[PDB]
Amino acid sequence: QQVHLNQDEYKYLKQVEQILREGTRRDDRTGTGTISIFGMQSKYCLRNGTIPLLTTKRVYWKGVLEELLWFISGSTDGKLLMEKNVKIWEKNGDRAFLDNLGFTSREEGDLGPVYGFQWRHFGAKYVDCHTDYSGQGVDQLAEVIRQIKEQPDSRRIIMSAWNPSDLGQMVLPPCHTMCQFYVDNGELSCQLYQRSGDMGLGVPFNLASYGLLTHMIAKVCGLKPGTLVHTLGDAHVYSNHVDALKIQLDREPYAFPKIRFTRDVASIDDFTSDMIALDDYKCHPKIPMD
Amino acid sequence: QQVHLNQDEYKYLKQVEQILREGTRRDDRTGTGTISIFGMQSKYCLRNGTIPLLTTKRVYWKGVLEELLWFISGSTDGKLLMEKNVKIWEKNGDRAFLDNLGFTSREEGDLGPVYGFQWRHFGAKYVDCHTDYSGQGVDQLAEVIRQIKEQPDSRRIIMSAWNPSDLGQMVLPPCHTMCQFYVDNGELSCQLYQRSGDMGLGVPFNLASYGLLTHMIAKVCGLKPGTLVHTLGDAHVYSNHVDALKIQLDREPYAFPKIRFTRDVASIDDFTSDMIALDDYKCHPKIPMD
Numbered sequence: 001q002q003v004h005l006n007q008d009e010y011k012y013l014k015q016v017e018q019i020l021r022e023g024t025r026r027d028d029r030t031g032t033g034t035i036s037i038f039g040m041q042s043k044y045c046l047r048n049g050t051i052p053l054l055t056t057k058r059v060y061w062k063g064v065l066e067e068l069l070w071f072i073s074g075s076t077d078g079k080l081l082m083e084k085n086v087k088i089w090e091k092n093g094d095r096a097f098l099d100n101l102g103f104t105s106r107e108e109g110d111l112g113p114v115y116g117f118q119w120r121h122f123g124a125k126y127v128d129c130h131t132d133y134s135g136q137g138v139d140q141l142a143e144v145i146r147q148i149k150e151q152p153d154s155r156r157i158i159m160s161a162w163n164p165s166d167l168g169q170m171v172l173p174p175c176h177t178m179c180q181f182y183v184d185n186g187e188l189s190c191q192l193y194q195r196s197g198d199m200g201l202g203v204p205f206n207l208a209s210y211g212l213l214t215h216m217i218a219k220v221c222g223l224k225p226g227t228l229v230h231t232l233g234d235a236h237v238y239s240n241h242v243d244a245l246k247i248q249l250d251r252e253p254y255a256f257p258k259i260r261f262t263r264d265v266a267s268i269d270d271f272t273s274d275m276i277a278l279d280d281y282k283c284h285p286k287i288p289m290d
Numbered sequence: 291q292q293v294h295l296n297q298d299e300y301k302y303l304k305q306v307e308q309i310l311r312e313g314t315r316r317d318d319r320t321g322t323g324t325i326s327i328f329g330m331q332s333k334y335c336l337r338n339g340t341i342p343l344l345t346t347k348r349v350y351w352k353g354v355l356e357e358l359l360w361f362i363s364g365s366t367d368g369k370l371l372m373e374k375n376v377k378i379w380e381k382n383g384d385r386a387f388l389d390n391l392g393f394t395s396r397e398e399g400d401l402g403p404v405y406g407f408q409w410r411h412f413g414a415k416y417v418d419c420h421t422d423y424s425g426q427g428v429d430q431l432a433e434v435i436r437q438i439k440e441q442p443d444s445r446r447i448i449m450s451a452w453n454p455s456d457l458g459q460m461v462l463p464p465c466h467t468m469c470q471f472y473v474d475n476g477e478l479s480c481q482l483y484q485r486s487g488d489m490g491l492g493v494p495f496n497l498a499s500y501g502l503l504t505h506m507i508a509k510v511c512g513l514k515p516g517t518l519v520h521t522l523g524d525a526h527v528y529s530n531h532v533d534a535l536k537i538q539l540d541r542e543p544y545a546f547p548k549i550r551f552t553r554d555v556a557s558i559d560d561f562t563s564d565m566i567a568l569d570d571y572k573c574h575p576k577i578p579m580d
């Protein structure tokens with residue numbers, strides 16, 4: 001009999017357990033050991049300000065926060081994010097990595113037609129991360145916002161960052177590939193499709209992003225938040241992290257933190273770091289990954 | 291719970307049953323009644339030639355067969371399906387329907403940059419349903435096959451029909467939005483994302499086509515079939531059919547039929563109707579009109 005304070009996070013821990021029990025022992029792109037299950041789905045409750053930030057292992061909240069605003073802005077420049085102290089895109093963006101992919105012409109932090117570009121200018125001809133793109137390409141995020149307001153029962157509210165044409169000039173293919181929105185009884189829900197997922201690091205970071213993104217759009221559209229559906233393709237754990245994930249599994253999860261917005265917004269482009277408060281984020285002791 | 295000859299189809303009946311018991315009552319695009327659950331996932335074994343053609347309610351197999359071959363060819367002309375007596379796109383590729391969308395310029399069978407165009411020529415400038423697009427756009431299906439053949443551990447094997455640039459010219463926005471492939475120990479698995487699915491008609495149809503597609507790609511790549519993962523956004527059942535479904539839910543599923551290819555194929559473009567054999571498709575009797 002399993003009664004849990006945070007049922008949703010417990011179900012996540014069960015996902016990790018299930019991967020380790022039933023998962024196939026394949027290899028990585030780098031030749032590293034991986035344990036994988038193909039095709040997984042879990043749901044997280046957002047109903048009263050709740051954001052799915054895992055309490056059994058600390059998630060880089062400030063990384064989630066600054067990156068999402070940096071996504072929404074349509075920005076493809078790595079430096080703007082590093083100004084905010086977030087170094088999550090640093091390795092991919094800087095000189096050495098670019099020259100390895102053959103981007104010798106490219107600037108110091110130019111990431112290519114990555115995420116935010118596609119989100120807000122799909123189909124637009126990309127040149128660099130400084131050229132103004134407004135007016136060019138499809139602004140999906142605007143379209144998604146419009147659909148929610150005018151056609152609440154639409155089964156077509158989709159935002160996709162997967163652009164076959166722009167994959168070549170991309171530094172890193174979209175891991176979070178697309179998402180669909182769903183209005184039910186004044187509540188806004190979101191389903192994320194993530195083609196690849198590390199349960200130790202990547203997945204909990206994407207939960208927090210698309211959880212946050214939902215909350216934001218919910219406010220912009222004057223709706224309450226509903227449910228985050230997290231769907232994975234390759235759900236996996238690294239072979240070296242198995243000891244580390246076993247420590248996480250024995251922990252009883254605390255309640256999720258809550259999102260609070262201090263002011264009001266004109267649109268989705270009106271959000272700033274200082275206005276997204278995170279309340280009561282309690283965590284378990286750190287997990288050594290070395 | 292209990293043992294079943296066809297554990298896979300039973301689980302589908304359980305999905306329909308879950309939608310009925312837990313699903314929210316909402317309105318359709320044309321003011322009809324649906325009962326809906328947002329975010330659902332199911333798996334279907336394809337090993338040893340098994341194709342998930344449901345047995346508790348006969349699936350229009352010839353439709354599946356002819357439409358998929360038609361997708362692969364890159365074709366987007368509806369008259370080509372009409373010639374094979376498959377009338378599933380008839381109502382959509384129709385003068386009045388096209389004029390209603392403002393496609394007054396259009397030919398009668400011209401459906402726009404729908405599935406087949408995006409699969410073989412993503413990003414190409416669409417003209418009409420008769421032009422030759424060889425060389426233009428990204429050939430995703432070919433890329434997917436190349437990836438499977440030489441990069442079988444890849445987590446980037448995606449083929450998407452969702453093109454925000456082309457949606458406006460589409461007679462209907464893609465329903466099976468995208469799919470991801472996955473190779474494990476010589477076994478090819480596939481995950482399909484459906485943004486909306488009628489459990490009574492569309493879903494069982496989409497199961498068969500992507501089931502079949504996986505079998506084809508496997509043969510082309512010299513691999514064996516694995517699993518089909520079917521992820522749904524708006525999984526729903528129409529209020530009109532609610533009685534017929536309860537009759538279907540009482541039926542014990544028979545064994546899924548087997549797919550048998552009767553000759554070798556040079557590529558994915560080498561598949562003809564006469565060569566795809568379907569063995570032992572035993573169904574339950576028809577249900578009184580839905």
Ligand SMILES: O=c1ccn([C@H]2C[C@H](O)[C@@H](COP(=O)(O)O)O2)c(=O)[nH]1
Pocket residue numbers: 029173175176196197198201202203206444445446
């Ligand atoms: O948003 C992200 C970005 C990266 N990863 C991790 C998971 C995989 O280990 C790896 C993906 O690399 P590819 O398989 O896409 O090459 O990075 C995520 O889980 N989520």
Ligand SMILES: O=c1ccn([C@H]2C[C@H](O)[C@@H](COP(=O)(O)O)O2)c(=O)[nH]1
Pocket residue numbers: 154155156319465466486487488491492493496
């Ligand atoms: O491949 C398909 C095509 C159509 N539909 C059905 C299910 C929905 O009832 C409807 C789609 O509604 P819209 O997404 O067009 O609103 O068509 C499917 O399930 N699968």
